[PDB]
Design a protein around this nucleic acid. Structure first.
Length: 46
RNA sequence: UUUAGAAGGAUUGCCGUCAGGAAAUUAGGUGCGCUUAGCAGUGUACCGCCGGAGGCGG
């Protein structure tokens, strides 16, 4: 999977990555994603 | 004080045609049922008498 590639880049990705967007440094975002947090409640949660 | 509190599933319909189950057989030898006993609520409810339902004699 793409997930396992962005954990340890193998170029197999980096080769194919950098030739269509020139922006893989920004995308590699999908690594330190923020965690979901409970901040309020509504009438639809039990 | 409940994974709290809410809810229309609904209308219609052609399953059909045909057919060889079949041949063979040894269920057999034994055997202690057996002590005791009272059928009935009285064995029936009969003749009359008053008296417009309820009563009284033998």
């Amino acid at each position: 999977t793409v997930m396992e590639h962005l954990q340890e880049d193998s170029a197999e990705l980096r080769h194919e990555m950098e030739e269509l967007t020139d922006k893989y440094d920004e995308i590699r975002g999908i690594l330190n994603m923020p965690s979901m947090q409970p901040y309020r409640t509504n009438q639809f949660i039990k």
